[PDB]
Design a protein around this ligand. Structure first.
Ligand SMILES: Cc1cc2nc3c(=O)[nH]c(=O)nc-3n(C[C@H](O)[C@H](O)[C@H](O)COP(=O)(O)OP(=O)(O)OC[C@H]3O[C@@H](n4cnc5c(N)ncnc54)[C@H](O)[C@@H]3O)c2cc1C
Ligand SMILES: [Mg+2]
Length: 277
């Protein structure tokens, strides 16, 4: 029994983006999971049946759900299952586990396949529910150097990026040069804006930027647009005197990971300085 297990209580499970919920868990007796930033826990689910029509999805985020009739879906799970989720809190955010969980719907080109089992279960959870977690685990840990760090995130990849960045600035009091580049579709898909604005205001070695690939009329957006690998290249790495000497930490959807890795490699960054997972 080397691995520990906690039956947690759901504090909240609010949408932060159209397809991402922030699951916040309270550890029993106020204790903390002894994890490292970049690490993960596992959630286990009992057998269950959930309906997407019962999810709490705010009107602000419902547009695509209505557009693609995503509330049609139901998920029946006959036997227990288990999956990993990355911590979004850093280790001195005690007493809690914060996760960012993307709902894995059936793909639009394959609309009658079963919905994602664990994420549909997690999206059914409401304040007061119980959630069993085990861990902690991980190998996506920061290197112990003084090298500049470039963090690149998309989607639910926000979670380990937040954990890493907060761990550096708050627990380690790092003075390393640090930037964070987050790509999202439109302004409603952004979140943790207060957290990262807060850190950038208080730490002259940290800056961050969001790029919107499809800003909406209501966003009145005048920030960066496009895909985050082009925005990072055009606005920072193209003129960087030694990009190969930075450490790049990233977590995003597969298409973002591939485009970023290709852009970094074409700049001469070696695989040893490109960290994922
Ligand atoms: C170390 C680690 C960290 C992770 N951290 C996070 C995190 O922070 N956030 C997060 O959201 N995820 C994270 N994940 C991923 C997570 O563990 C799950 O893989 C994710 O939630 C999807 O699992 P699921 O059970 O919901 O979907 P699954 O049931 O595994 O299904 C996956 C997808 O396949 C589709 N599908 C189902 N059946 C078929 C079929 N017959 N044909 C075609 N397609 C089909 C489903 O509709 C769904 O879209 C992490 C994974 C690892 C390993
Ligand atoms: Mg949002």
């Amino acid at each position: 029994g080397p691995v520990k297990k906690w039956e947690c209580t759901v504090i909240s499970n609010d949408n932060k983006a159209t397809f991402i919920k922030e699951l916040k868990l309270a550890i029993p007796d106020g204790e903390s999971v002894p994890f490292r930033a970049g690490g993960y826990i596992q959630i286990e689910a009992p057998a269950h049946h959930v309906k997407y029509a019962d999810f709490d999805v705010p009107e602000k985020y419902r547009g695509d759900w209505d557009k693609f009739n995503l509330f049609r879906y139901e998920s029946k799970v006959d036997e227990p299952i288990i999956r990993a989720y990355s911590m979004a809190n850093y280790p001195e955010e005690f007493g809690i586990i914060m996760l960012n969980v993307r709902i894995a719907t059936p793909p639009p080109n394959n609309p009658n396949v079963p919905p994602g089992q664990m994420s549909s279960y997690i999206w059914s959870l409401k304040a007061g529910d119980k959630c069993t977690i085990s861990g902690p685990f991980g190998e996506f840990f920061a290197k112990d150097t003084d090298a500049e760090m470039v963090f690149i995130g998309g989607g639910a990849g926000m979670a380990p990026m937040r954990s890493h960045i907060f761990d550096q600035l708050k627990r380690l009091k790092s003075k390393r040069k640090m930037s964070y580049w987050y790509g999202a579709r439109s302004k409603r898909e952004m979140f943790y804006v207060e957290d990262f604005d807060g850190l950038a205001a208080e730490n002259d070695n940290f800056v961050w930027h969001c790029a919107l690939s499809d800003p909406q009329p209501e966003d009145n957006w005048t920030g960066y647009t496009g895909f985050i690998h082009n925005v990072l290249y055009e606005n920072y790495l193209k003129d960087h005197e030694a990009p190969e000497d930075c450490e790049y930490y990233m977590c995003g959807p597969p298409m973002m990971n591939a485009a970023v890795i290709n852009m970094l490699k074409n700049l001469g960054v070696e695989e040893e300085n490109i960290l994922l997972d």
